[PDB]
Design a protein around this ligand. Sequence first.
Ligand SMILES: [K+]
Ligand SMILES: [K+]
Ligand SMILES: [K+]
Ligand SMILES: [K+]
Ligand SMILES: [K+]
Ligand SMILES: [K+]
Ligand SMILES: [K+]
Ligand SMILES: [K+]
Ligand SMILES: [Mg+2]
Ligand SMILES: [Mg+2]
Ligand SMILES: [Mg+2]
Ligand SMILES: [Mg+2]
Ligand SMILES: [Mg+2]
Ligand SMILES: [Mg+2]
Ligand SMILES: [Mg+2]
Ligand SMILES: [Mg+2]
Ligand SMILES: [Mg+2]
Ligand SMILES: [Mg+2]
Ligand SMILES: [Mg+2]
Ligand SMILES: [Mg+2]
Ligand SMILES: [Mg+2]
Ligand SMILES: [Mg+2]
Ligand SMILES: [Mg+2]
Ligand SMILES: [Mg+2]
Ligand SMILES: [Mg+2]
Ligand SMILES: [Mg+2]
Ligand SMILES: [Mg+2]
Ligand SMILES: [Mg+2]
Ligand SMILES: [Mg+2]
Ligand SMILES: [Mg+2]
Ligand SMILES: [Mg+2]
Ligand SMILES: [Mg+2]
Ligand SMILES: [Mg+2]
Ligand SMILES: [Mg+2]
Ligand SMILES: [Mg+2]
Ligand SMILES: [Mg+2]
Ligand SMILES: [Mg+2]
Ligand SMILES: [Mg+2]
Ligand SMILES: [Mg+2]
Ligand SMILES: [Mg+2]
Lengths: 122, 203, 51, 50, 155
Amino acid sequence: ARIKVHELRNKSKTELLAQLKDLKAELALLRVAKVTGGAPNKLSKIKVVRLSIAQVLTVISQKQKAALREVYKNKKYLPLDLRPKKTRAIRKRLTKHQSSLKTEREKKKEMYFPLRKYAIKV
Amino acid sequence: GAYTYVSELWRKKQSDVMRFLQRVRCWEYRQLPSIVRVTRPTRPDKARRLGYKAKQGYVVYRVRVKRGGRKRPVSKGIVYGKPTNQGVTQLKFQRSKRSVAEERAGRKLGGLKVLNSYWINEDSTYKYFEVILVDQAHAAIRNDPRINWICNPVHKHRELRGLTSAGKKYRGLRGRGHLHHKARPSRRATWKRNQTLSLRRYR
Amino acid sequence: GRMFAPTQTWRRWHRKIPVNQKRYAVASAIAASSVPSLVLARGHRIESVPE
Amino acid sequence: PSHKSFMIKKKLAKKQRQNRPIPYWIRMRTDNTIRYNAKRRHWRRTKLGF
Amino acid sequence: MKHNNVIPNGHFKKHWQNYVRTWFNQPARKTRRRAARQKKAATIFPRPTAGSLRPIVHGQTLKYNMKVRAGRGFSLEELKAAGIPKKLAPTIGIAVDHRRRNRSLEGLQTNVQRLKTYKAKLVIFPRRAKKVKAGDSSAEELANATQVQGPYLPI
RNA sequence: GCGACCCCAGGUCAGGCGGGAUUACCCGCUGAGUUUAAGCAUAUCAAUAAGCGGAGGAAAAGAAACUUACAAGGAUUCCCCUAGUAACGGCGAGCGAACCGGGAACAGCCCAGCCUUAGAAUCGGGCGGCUCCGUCGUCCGAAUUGUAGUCUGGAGAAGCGU
RNA sequence: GUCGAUCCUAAGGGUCGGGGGAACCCCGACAGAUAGCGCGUCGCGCGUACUCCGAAAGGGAAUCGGGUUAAAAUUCCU
Ligand SMILES: [K+]
Ligand SMILES: [K+]
Ligand SMILES: [K+]
Ligand SMILES: [K+]
Ligand SMILES: [K+]
Ligand SMILES: [K+]
Ligand SMILES: [K+]
Ligand SMILES: [K+]
Ligand SMILES: [Mg+2]
Ligand SMILES: [Mg+2]
Ligand SMILES: [Mg+2]
Ligand SMILES: [Mg+2]
Ligand SMILES: [Mg+2]
Ligand SMILES: [Mg+2]
Ligand SMILES: [Mg+2]
Ligand SMILES: [Mg+2]
Ligand SMILES: [Mg+2]
Ligand SMILES: [Mg+2]
Ligand SMILES: [Mg+2]
Ligand SMILES: [Mg+2]
Ligand SMILES: [Mg+2]
Ligand SMILES: [Mg+2]
Ligand SMILES: [Mg+2]
Ligand SMILES: [Mg+2]
Ligand SMILES: [Mg+2]
Ligand SMILES: [Mg+2]
Ligand SMILES: [Mg+2]
Ligand SMILES: [Mg+2]
Ligand SMILES: [Mg+2]
Ligand SMILES: [Mg+2]
Ligand SMILES: [Mg+2]
Ligand SMILES: [Mg+2]
Ligand SMILES: [Mg+2]
Ligand SMILES: [Mg+2]
Ligand SMILES: [Mg+2]
Ligand SMILES: [Mg+2]
Ligand SMILES: [Mg+2]
Ligand SMILES: [Mg+2]
Ligand SMILES: [Mg+2]
Ligand SMILES: [Mg+2]
């Protein structure tokens, strides 16, 4: 009957483009009916077809993005669109390792004289 | 250990050797623009005691600043006010020439962090400083525990908030006790605290 | 427009009565609670209270 | 005037679209308080200022 | 100005109304500080909630030299007399002040005894579970290993 | 002429960084007059408003070139007190801190310089692998006009042994 | 495509570098390794610091009749 998204994800790339082509052609006819005094029932189909076109485009874009992220997985440099967004300030932060870097003497103090666990007898 | 010889030689600025070297350098600087990148510090001994290290990420710029006081920037020297405020000349900027040199380099080099600076030469018209800047984005800096503190956001434009060595001087922070107490934590913070009218609940 | 003498938050809302006077008031109230005439006079229904 | 920029003509087109009565079915909605179009403009009474 | 009155000297000629400090948050501040102390006590358990051991010091000037109070930290000379290395003292709840001098024997001896008393009733857990090293206690880690609230060596 | 170095120039060269917005609090600069003085010019309003910049969840300050003169305290900040006081002021109008003392909190530290010279032991980048905020290998660079270690006056280096 | 804008430069405007300036900003090709262009097929030659904005009346490639709409035309039709 209507478009089911989980069924679209099982289709191949060519099938989605073919279905997208049909949906756009169908929507064009509905637009003609809207200006030629089409029946009210046919004017309600515009909303359904518009939803279908968006769903097909969403599946196509999601698959394309997912494949690209797998291609650049484990690569040093990624396209800016695929890099994490977060915030500007968060991206400029020192890494976790860099923030914890200390001098050799500071490292030795942590080992030689760390805070000890102790208690006072009552 | 050669730096002590260089440092002691630079303490004798009126000797013939230094007067000749400074005279030639002063001419050379006048011919170049007011802010110039230098391949290496002119005073390596002085630079490294202010934090400079000979590694990628550290850069040195020479800044030229004009000498003298601060003429009040008012049209035709006309002041609309009482005589106490009618002075135009013999007015002095509250910040020092060293601070100005840091600010000039900092504003121009927005992608770098100002670390420190030092005097290198002067004539009657101009004063010359070298400003040490750090590329906080360079990996060599970010992996160095002694300098990577400057990569944190709280240290943005230290020179424009008076947080450099020259900044602490003109804010009155070089010193403590009865002669400098009004400068901490800041002069305006002290004023606001002392002006506060504390109206407690039970008074 | 603007009201006359606008109300300010630093009005003196609180009061600190001396502690010894506050203890005096509490003791008087405790003593008054043992007088049935006063308890009745305050509107309490203690007609069936044993004591 | 007849000589007009693309930008100005686009702005004038939007103003024309906004210069209409409210649909009648708007006043029949639940909890409706919109009585009429309070931003109606007449070319001779109030000028667009550009 | 009229009548016989004290000469007024109200300092209300500036924009003082912009610098009024109210205290309506005073109860809230008490609540927040109590919560911080309660949270801190659980973090440092079983270490005492009173914090590090502080030395006994005299009040300054002629007006307060007859009384004693808590100081910042034990001097290096006091720590050496008590046989506690300065780098180990802060890790077992002893405050260290490398600036304080010792002009008299009485002041030095008072704090040295204070350190020895503190060490007498100090239980130190081993850094690692099984192996026990010098300075650590044995069989006392469970008997009386509780978090003491309030001062333990009051001045 | 061929090379090394120095300085500089060009590059849509490879990979990074910066600008602007926001106003309650915060940091730097600049900076009035109304007003008060029953006039008014110093003063006061005010080291304030307006103006120009820069940050953060806090900022700033901070481990004494301090307080003090005592039987001495011991980074910074904040509250109470000091105190409408010492002082300043056409000593007029007015103005005005700090130390001690009691509390909130509590934390200390890192470099520069003489000291690897039987070995730049340091770091970046390209490429590759792995247990991928990193680590390992390799190559090319940075650096001796000095990277990394050791040291920071509270010490410390060296030697000796517990 | 043919009417204009668009192109060109005018008084002037906005700027690089440089010089000033706490900064907002000031001067404006004046402190300077210009822009590039041409001819061969990457090489030779040339090369005086703005390839910028600034005119619906200045300069300026090319459209004429006839017909057509309720409302458009040297733009639609022939
Ligand atoms: K003025
Ligand atoms: K005055
Ligand atoms: K009276
Ligand atoms: K408050
Ligand atoms: K590598
Ligand atoms: K024209
Ligand atoms: K002409
Ligand atoms: K025709
Ligand atoms: Mg370099
Ligand atoms: Mg009209
Ligand atoms: Mg208007
Ligand atoms: Mg007033
Ligand atoms: Mg105390
Ligand atoms: Mg590039
Ligand atoms: Mg007057
Ligand atoms: Mg009057
Ligand atoms: Mg008057
Ligand atoms: Mg302001
Ligand atoms: Mg900003
Ligand atoms: Mg933020
Ligand atoms: Mg906080
Ligand atoms: Mg800070
Ligand atoms: Mg020190
Ligand atoms: Mg103190
Ligand atoms: Mg009093
Ligand atoms: Mg004043
Ligand atoms: Mg204070
Ligand atoms: Mg105190
Ligand atoms: Mg070294
Ligand atoms: Mg050693
Ligand atoms: Mg030693
Ligand atoms: Mg024409
Ligand atoms: Mg012209
Ligand atoms: Mg301009
Ligand atoms: Mg310029
Ligand atoms: Mg020229
Ligand atoms: Mg042109
Ligand atoms: Mg033009
Ligand atoms: Mg014309
Ligand atoms: Mg017509």
